[PDB]
């Protein structure tokens, strides 16, 4: 090295310094993919989360809940190759549905993807007020041995729906962090944070062997 290579090495060391800065910034940033045919639910949750934590194609969203960087990607077999640095997947599914078949077909496709093997899954159920509204005027799905209790209290209906997404899963040991979601946003952000934290705790302990 002599008189120009020393300067080039200084330049490369500076670039390494900048890259290390951004690794420090990035390794803390956890990713939560968003999916589901409930576009209105997607928009509403996005707006509420950004309202709390800020104060076409893929539509990224960056924010920070409790000093923890969230990147909600909000998106296909080739796209998902780029998405295995992720810590969860959300499905926005409207509880008042048929649309349950469509949603659970989509969930079956996403839940067992090999690239998402180590990715926890949160099923955000939306408009539970609309669900009880359609419980009062019973919408009867008679295509499975689970109508037992269908024209009854909302709780049985919710249990059947949550099972329906538990249904069509083939890679368990990372449980589905089911929520019954409403229009209040603080509890929504809490659900997301708690689910992601439990996912990371379980992965740390399982990969440290307890």
């Amino acid at each position: 090295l002599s008189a120009e290579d020393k300067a080039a090495v200084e330049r490369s060391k500076m670039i390494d310094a900048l890259l290390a800065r951004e690794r420090r910034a990035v390794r803390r940033l956890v990713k939560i993919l968003l999916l589901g045919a409930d576009n209105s639910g997607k928009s509403t949750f996005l707006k509420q989360m950004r309202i709390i934590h800020v104060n076409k194609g893929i539509v990224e969203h960056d924010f920070v809940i409790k000093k923890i960087p969230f990147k909600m990607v909000d998106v296909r077999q080739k796209w998902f190759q780029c998405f295995d640095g992720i810590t969860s997947i959300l499905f926005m599914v409207d509880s008042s549905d048929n649309r349950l078949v469509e949603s659970m077909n989509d969930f079956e496709t996403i839940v067992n993807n090999k690239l998402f093997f180590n990715v926890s899954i949160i099923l955000f159920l939306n408009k539970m007020d609309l669900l009880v509204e359609k419980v009062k005027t019973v919408s009867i799905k008679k295509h499975f041995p689970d109508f037992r209790g269908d024209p009854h209290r909302l709780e049985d209906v919710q249990r059947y729906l949550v099972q329906c997404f538990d249904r069509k899963r083939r890679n368990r040991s990372k449980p589905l962090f089911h929520h019954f979601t409403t229009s209040i946003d603080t509890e929504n952000a809490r659900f997301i944070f708690h689910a992601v934290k439990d996912t990371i705790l379980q992965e740390n302990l399982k990969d440290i062997m307890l």
Binding site: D5, V9, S12, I15, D16, L19, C82
Partner: peptide, 28 residues
């Protein structure tokens, strides 16, 4: 790289000639 970065290296010396930040982290 998925970093949103594009690095130009000197292979003989393992120097970084350039670091190009990209508007999209999804570079293929």
């Amino acid at each position: 790289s998925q970093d949103g970065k594009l690095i130009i290296w000197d292979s003989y010396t393992t120097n970084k000639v350039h670091a190009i930040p990209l508007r999209s982290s999804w570079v293929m």
